[PDB]
Design a protein around this ligand. Structure first.
Ligand SMILES: CC(=O)c1ccc2cc(N(C)C)ccc2c1
Length: 257
């Protein structure tokens, strides 16, 4: 779109857009195959692999961890090094708060970034490139591919776990519920969607003004939209503006509504 190019101009940023209406197969694309650091959006796919692995009862497994597992941002995990946390609780904290220690513990449990990669390849994702813990500070730079993905691949993988057959329905329900009750995305995709429509989302933030959000958006009646809005900027220490994500989403909704 001229419309997306305008937003890149207004915000001095690079935009990556992919949206699929699952009820019509209509598509919205703008740099859909351009790579961006996936950042915390990977937490969503990590839980997908986690669920696939485990049974639902197995998620009640208690993980004991230490202060040495605490990283830069540990809003839930810092409160329970005494008690530990169950895998289910770690998935909650990772998805809904973007608790970084929680993600690290879950990654360890699934066998690390190498194992996460191997599992994403198995579900048909050849693009997404998990390599490191804390993705995210790698880093990296242009135009290296470690810990990156594209708007297309993230949509395709999110859809696979959340909506298709990479998971049985009761595990689907957990992932979707956690993402619906995300606390970190109010100013992003959620702010670009019409009022009262349910949204499941996972946010990401990285250097180079990288600000990301992947989402499933249910219209009142009928089939959901799966969307990835990715963004980055020129300078390593550039700041992002959440408003870019909300406005991009508005453009996407107009192109499909
Ligand atoms: C887990 C971890 O060690 C870590 C450390 C620093 C981080 C800085 C970020 N931004 C400056 C956006 C984002 C994620 C980060 C994660």
């Amino acid at each position: 779109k001229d419309d997306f190019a305008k937003l890149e101009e207004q915000f001095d940023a690079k935009l990556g857009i992919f949206a699929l209406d699952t009820g019509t197969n209509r598509t919205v694309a703008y740099r859909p195959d351009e790579r961006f650091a996936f950042a915390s959006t990977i937490k969503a796919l990590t839980v997908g692999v986690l669920l696939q692995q485990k049974s639902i009862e197995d998620l009640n497994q208690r993980i004991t961890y230490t202060r040495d597992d605490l990283v830069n941002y540990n809003p839930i995990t810092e409160k329970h090094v005494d008690t530990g946390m169950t895998l289910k609780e770690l998935a909650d904290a990772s998805l809904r708060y973007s608790d970084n220690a929680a993600q690290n513990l879950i990654l360890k449990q699934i066998g690390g970034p190498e194992s996460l990669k191997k599992e994403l390849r198995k579900i048909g994702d050849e693009v997404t490139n998990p390599e490191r813990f804390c993705p995210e500070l790698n880093e990296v730079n242009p135009g290296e591919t470690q810990d990156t993905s594209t708007a297309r691949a993230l949509v395709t993988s999110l859809r696979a776990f959340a909506l298709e057959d990479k998971l049985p329905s009761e595990k689907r329900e957990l992932l979707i519920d956690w993402m619906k009750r995300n606390t970190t995305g109010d100013a992003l995709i959620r702010a670009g969607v019409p009022d009262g429509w349910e949204v499941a989302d996972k946010t990401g933030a990285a250097s180079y003004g990288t600000r990301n959000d992947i989402a499933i958006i249910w219209p009142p009646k009928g089939d959901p939209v799966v969307l990835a809005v990715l963004s980055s900027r020129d300078k390593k220490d550039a700041k992002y503006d959440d408003k870019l994500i909300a406005e991009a989403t508005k453009v996407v909704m107009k192109a499909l509504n």
